[PDB]
Amino acid sequence: AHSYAEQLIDTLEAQGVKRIYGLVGDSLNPIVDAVRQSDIEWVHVRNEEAAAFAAGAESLITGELAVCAASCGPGNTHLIQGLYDSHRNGAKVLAIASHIPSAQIGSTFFQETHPEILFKECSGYCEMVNGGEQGERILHHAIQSTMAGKGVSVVVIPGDIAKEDAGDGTYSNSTISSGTPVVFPDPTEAAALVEAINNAKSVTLFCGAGVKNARAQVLELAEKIKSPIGHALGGKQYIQHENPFEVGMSGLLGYGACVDASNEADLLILLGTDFPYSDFLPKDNVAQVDINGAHIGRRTTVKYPVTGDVAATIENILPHVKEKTDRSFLDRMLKAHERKLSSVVETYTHNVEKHVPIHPEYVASILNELADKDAVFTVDTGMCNVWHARYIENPEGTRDFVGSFRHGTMANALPHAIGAQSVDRNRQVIAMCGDGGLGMLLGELLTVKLHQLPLKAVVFNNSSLGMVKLEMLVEGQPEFGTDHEEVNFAEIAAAAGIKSVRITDPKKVREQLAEALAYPGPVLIDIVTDPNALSIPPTITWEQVMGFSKAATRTVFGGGVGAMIDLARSNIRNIPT
Amino acid sequence: AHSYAEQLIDTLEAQGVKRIYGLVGDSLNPIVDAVRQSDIEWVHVRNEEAAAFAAGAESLITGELAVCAASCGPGNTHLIQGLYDSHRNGAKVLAIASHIPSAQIGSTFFQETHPEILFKECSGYCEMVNGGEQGERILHHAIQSTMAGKGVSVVVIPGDIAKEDAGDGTYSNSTISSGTPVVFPDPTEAAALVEAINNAKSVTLFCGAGVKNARAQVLELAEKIKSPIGHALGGKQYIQHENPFEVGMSGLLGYGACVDASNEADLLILLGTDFPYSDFLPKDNVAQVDINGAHIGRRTTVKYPVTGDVAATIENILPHVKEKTDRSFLDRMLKAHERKLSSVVETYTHNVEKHVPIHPEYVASILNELADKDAVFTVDTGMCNVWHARYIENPEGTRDFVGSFRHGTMANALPHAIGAQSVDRNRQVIAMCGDGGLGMLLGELLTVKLHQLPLKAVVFNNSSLGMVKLEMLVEGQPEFGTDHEEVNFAEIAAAAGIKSVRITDPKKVREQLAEALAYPGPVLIDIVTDPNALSIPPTITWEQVMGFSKAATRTVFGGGVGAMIDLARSNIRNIPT
Amino acid sequence: AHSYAEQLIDTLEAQGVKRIYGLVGDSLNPIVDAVRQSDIEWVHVRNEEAAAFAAGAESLITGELAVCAASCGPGNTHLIQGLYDSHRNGAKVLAIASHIPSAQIGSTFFQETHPEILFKECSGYCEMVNGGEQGERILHHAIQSTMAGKGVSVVVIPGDIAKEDAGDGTYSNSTISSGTPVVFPDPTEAAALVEAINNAKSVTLFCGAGVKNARAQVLELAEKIKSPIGHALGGKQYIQHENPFEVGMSGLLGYGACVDASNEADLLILLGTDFPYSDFLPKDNVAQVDINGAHIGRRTTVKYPVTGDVAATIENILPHVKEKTDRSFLDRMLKAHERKLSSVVETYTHNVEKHVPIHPEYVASILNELADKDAVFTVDTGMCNVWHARYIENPEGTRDFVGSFRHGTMANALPHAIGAQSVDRNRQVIAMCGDGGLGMLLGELLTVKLHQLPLKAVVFNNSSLGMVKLEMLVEGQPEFGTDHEEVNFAEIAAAAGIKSVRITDPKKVREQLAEALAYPGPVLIDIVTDPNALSIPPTITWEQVMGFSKAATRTVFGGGVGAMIDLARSNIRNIPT
Ligand SMILES: Cc1cc2nc3c(=O)[nH]c(=O)nc-3n(C[C@H](O)[C@H](O)[C@H](O)COP(=O)(O)OP(=O)(O)OC[C@H]3O[C@@H](n4cnc5c(N)ncnc54)[C@H](O)[C@@H]3O)c2cc1C
Ligand SMILES: Cc1cc2nc3c(=O)[nH]c(=O)nc-3n(C[C@H](O)[C@H](O)[C@H](O)COP(=O)(O)OP(=O)(O)OC[C@H]3O[C@@H](n4cnc5c(N)ncnc54)[C@H](O)[C@@H]3O)c2cc1C
């Protein structure tokens, strides 16, 4: 007979898990012994928070289960930031939360916590093992819940019970459902959407991450009804590239004509998006297609709700949607889009290649050009989100992106890159780090060195909490607490045994970044950038930066955009005569 | 400008809510004033627990939102049993939990509780209002969550904030998605199910509540592959009637050949069921079709998982499923089914019409014959669940049933009947009450009298917690705490102003129950029944009654069955020669 | 070897527990079998909510542990209202929450709930048993926590584990600390209070339940510094009787000069009170003595905080407090107090003995005169709280009182009386019931009959939610939802086998109530009272009734007072010349 720890690891191995991220100790020793004897690799991190980020990033890249593990009490407590992030991102993650010995539960014991209560908000399933047999059962339920799309699962395992005898295999013997059902809409909701589209003279589509598997259908619908296509940040990687109807992104980090096209069309269709900034959304005549009905109408007035998959809904309605031959609205919005992008480049990035200290938008433009066509980019929360949104492209859809776009935590970039890089050491992974984010989990440079992960950590080092400095400028409150003395991350990385370079001259950015990106190993690129590069229209308020101003707005943060302008201009040249 | 209380009630009225069940007080006075001025009826109950049961039953009958409401602190605390029941039953219920004044939150004030924390387990959405505008928003989110099938929603409203100004209408103006999407399976999961069916020589279908809208498809599949059809208790009302393949129900309250057909077939297919008694389920070769992937494999080994709707999955696979011409397995199971039903009638209900005290199975047989073809039956948890399962039929599918089949609470029958009867006073509603259940919420007889609800409360009065007496007999522990001195519910009902009859002679059951069921008003029927009528095989253990014995079993509680035997016998006579 | 169920009951028996209140079923059968074999009596209730109220009332009367018990899932869910009440009242209660079988936890099983999470707010200790040995340990910890004054303890016991082997006795062998430590104040805080008293020319003491064991010390301090003594409702039973400095109670149910004496004195001292209605409390110069430092300053500005016991603090300061020879303030407040009480009697209860329907204040005056000198009174939340506060006296301190004065739940009176009466069947127990409260848990009349508890249920039957009708009159909102058709509780009680009388003529109240109170058995007294008897000053607002108006007030609800005026008048006649 095997123990429950051995059955746990055999079940994960049989499901194809290749790695577990974590930090060993106490109630986790029987589980780590079983890992040693299996083909699963143990990936040691310095802070268990990084293990939960790394597992979430691995799962977003692979589309499969990923796993993190931590010791009792304080050990598993450290998972929590990464579990919130993974849960909000819809990752397929199992967290093994080792727990104090069962006989000491309820006695205010050394290290006691109640993880089975603490992790309820950052999980779709979270239960405690109380015996080997029941442990097999709740491991199945946890894996089946996360694979069905319910978000993070936590299994809480008192250390003693991991050494108890395994269950009889009834539940570990099951095949897990990991398929993708095809969700067609209710015919009554679909018919109301057809009527709304056919009655409208102009339509705009606004897409989010829910169009990941619906590019062909969204483009086919747009060609038929001559609709501009805008996106939320979660839709950018899927719908912006090679899109003849492209009109940009809404929100403060937005760009182009998206806000105007969304608000001026007779009908706006929200496709697979939960974009939260309601002040940028119209209310007059909006449809929304979402696979989770509970999300419909969360962000603005929706008159035509449709619970359904985007691709299946468009396939179902298309034969009933009339072709629109008038593309005057689309042409006006494509022209306004290109004019707006050209205008922000002229206003904000004139001679940006000579700006000192180095302008982060110059770095981001060069990074987009130099990085591989299939690189993974990870994005630290803060001003790196602006540089990703406005400069990092996805030609042919072959790059991947991982960030904290929903939970919005700092310090995610380097741990996300550790997980993404572990999937395939031959694929380039670029972590766009802030100095605040990197400092917050600095010890994970020791993890990169230990595992020899050949990721490229690009530090936008401006010695400032740049996004907070923006929020304070916008509020009109004296700058305080954001900027501190400079740190030399290249020297810290070199002291940790990582190849590094420090870039201070804009004239050497292109050559030094090309050399670093081509280095066959881990490398940290410490770029000293301008802390005052973020430009802000004086009319933006702290209530808008914080997201609680409901009054209609079309204003975005200042700054330029990058290579997205090439598609905007080819779309103008291809407008039918 | 309106207040938030007025906007709350206008939004519910615009959505078609006709009634709110509750008990007025304190922070709920502004909301009740708005109800008075609207077309919504206030249905006063004596204990707010009954309001939450009544709302859950109303929604199960109508398929639409139902609403309950209660005052701060202790008032809304009383909702909780009915919210768990409604939530487990998948009802579409909004609970308005009035709360203490916002300025006193956090001060250990008079009546203070934290309902926004307490009701997390019995809801899919539960949040606190902190201003009129945000209150409009979370009311929308709560209604959209319950209408999308996520279970109960709770909106917690500090009393003072109900008098604050209303939001601007952005969220109340939305149309709620209440449609039913059509969920086809992933083609890879569907193809594996086709291969399993075509490889199997014999197949049995085991259906639950998830086949509600798939009768035609289940029967078409059964005719093609010659499969017996069994059911869980939640499937009985939908699949047993007019079913040429009928083989009964599994579990301790089960009957017929279902356990044998499910365990002897080469392949068992679980269709829309989460039947929890794993010791009755095989493990060797099982498929499961469920619309919620997280439920697959919860109860036994599943080798062919399919996330999908039952009807859409069967429609998709049918052209690829080969017709089976050999119906030897089906014929053997139909013959065994009828033999087993005839045997339990001969063993347990010989001369049952002369048994004294009155046998509850004699009452249940007469109640099935006399009740209307479209009656609603509500079923009190306990031995009434056995009498429903084995005696109350659903010819042509026109009756409806409400019970606590998942949460398993006592005392639900009379409050469920209050909600079901409020939907249509011209429809017959029969509450199958136990003396324990009725005593537990006895004050709701005052509610029946106040609202003149013409329901028929049939009390199986055996002065005993009959199901607990069974559990103790099965364990082999001396009877204690279950049986107490007799109560005259007919005299209590008459003292409350309700028409009543007391039935003690088996020779008068048919005439007295016919007269009472035909009474044009509320009526309580107090039937003095035999507390020792539940027969138990000595091999049943307390571990089996409690549901924690995993060893394979086919043993059911003793007792007979009713009119279901007529279909069993016609199915034998129609077996092709 | 014994089982954990047997060890649980042996441990309670060894600690002196005489009874357990509850309702048998499932996971509780092994525990009830152990009770049968012990000397503990099982007290069957009809709804487990009543068991938790009865245990809380028993403990308040005895000063010892009391116990309630309920079955898994829905069974223990029903305890919750009574656990909140017992917890807020500081009762010493163990709740045995039977739970689903451990192997099914986490599987969404039949009846599954998580009581170990649900009951966190209504308990000081709440943990789950996961084995027999750890179960012995957390039973000790639960008993020691409640006996040390931390409020309710809940032990959650999966049914299967109750049959597991008992622990080794290490923790059940301990003696529980149930002593009362003597908490002297910090000398620095005490010296600041001495300076405040000696600097003040006039002082008023305002006492709550924390003066229970400090009557002699409070009176000695008042004689020395010539201070009026007022009380919160929780202090009334301890400090009003035979008090030469008595000036009444504050709050809307208040009376006499208390609000004026508290606000006009140079120094107000809060002694053992957490009175929550801040608009009645001054802010200028207030001291507060409380044994729980976290409570100091919860309700108004406190300049002289003292963490300490009332009696020990007064004993410590008394030698340093200077005698005040000027009693002009005390004399002015004693005269104003008696004038105010005489005025409300003249305004509101002129010829009250002839008022029809019967006036509840006439009933309350007669009930105070006729009830025994050592009776227990239980008080249903609602208008019965006004009648208790203004009419039920405690001469020589020999009566006891139980109510829901902090949690404020309806329906507590009859279940509180069941627990208080079970302590000593020879002691008179009077339940002051409202028709709303009694209807809410009406089935507990069957409990009174079953156990032959000789309590006297006095129903103030006005067919109205009287306190809510007051709140609506005060708000100026049309009356709705409070008054319904009349119920005959005397006929319902007689149908339940309880002696009853229906009183409708004011001329027969005294004789019929005297006869009923002297009946040697259970009796229900259904008094048809005037629903419009509660008088309200038009200046009271719904914000004041709800407790969120902070503006200074001295206004109380209209109505008269009773025999308290005799002490007010003797105190005037004894003012030194
Ligand atoms: C510092 C910072 C600033 C930010 N600023 C902005 C900004 O200015 N602009 C911006 O756009 N974002 C911004 N974001 C991100 C923003 O908060 C949201 O996370 C993002 O807009 C949501 O993108 P989304 O709608 O694509 O994804 P989600 O919020 O994940 O929504 C996806 C939706 O698709 C649905 N869905 C999934 N699959 C399907 C399917 N097959 N069919 C149908 N529906 C489906 C889901 O149910 C869900 O409702 C910022 C983030 C950070 C960290
Ligand atoms: C005292 C008592 C005794 C009991 N004894 C028994 C007994 O002996 N036998 C018994 O059978 N029950 C018994 N029960 C009830 C039992 O506990 C379960 O509640 C019941 O078996 C579950 O029935 P079900 O599977 O139909 O419903 P559910 O548990 O509600 O499961 C329905 C399933 O269908 C799925 N679904 C819903 N819609 C669709 C769709 N369109 N397509 C696909 N899937 C869908 C759901 O996701 C879910 O998994 C008892 C109850 C009581 C109160």
Ligand SMILES: Cc1cc2nc3c(=O)[nH]c(=O)nc-3n(C[C@H](O)[C@H](O)[C@H](O)COP(=O)(O)OP(=O)(O)OC[C@H]3O[C@@H](n4cnc5c(N)ncnc54)[C@H](O)[C@@H]3O)c2cc1C
């Ligand atoms: C419908 C209704 C209306 C009400 N209206 C009123 C009203 O108008 N007026 C009114 O007064 N009440 C009213 N109440 C009750 C009110 O809400 C409070 O519960 C009550 O005033 C508190 O009384 P208390 O301060 O004595 O008790 P508690 O709130 O229990 O406070 C006792 C304090 O004493 C402290 N303490 C305990 N022992 C010691 C010790 N040995 N030494 C020192 N400190 C100690 C405790 O830590 C605590 O802070 C009403 C109740 C109801 C149900």
Ligand SMILES: Cc1ncc(C[n+]2csc(CCOP(=O)(O)OP(=O)(O)O)c2C)c(N)n1
């Ligand atoms: C753990 C955490 N702390 C604080 C914040 C708030 N926050 C959001 S962005 C930001 C600054 C991020 O700093 P850095 O990584 O240097 O990037 P910058 O904005 O300068 O690019 C801060 C403080 C956060 N979301 N997460």
Ligand SMILES: Cc1ncc(C[n+]2csc(CCOP(=O)(O)OP(=O)(O)O)c2C)c(N)n1
């Ligand atoms: C609130 C609650 N308390 C206890 C139980 C446990 N229980 C389940 S069935 C049963 C007896 C039900 O009694 P009654 O209504 O008289 O029906 P009977 O079994 O006699 O038909 C009990 C105690 C429950 N599930 N719910």
Ligand SMILES: Cc1ncc(C[n+]2csc(CCOP(=O)(O)OP(=O)(O)O)c2C)c(N)n1
């Ligand atoms: C469970 C519960 N529901 C509602 C309330 C609100 N409430 C407080 S007093 C009151 C009326 C009490 O009625 P009754 O027992 O008839 O006494 P009355 O005020 O008429 O004397 C109500 C509705 C409460 N606190 N508890």
Ligand SMILES: [Mg+2]
């Ligand atoms: Mg920075």
Ligand SMILES: [Mg+2]
């Ligand atoms: Mg019974």
Ligand SMILES: [Mg+2]
């Ligand atoms: Mg009343």
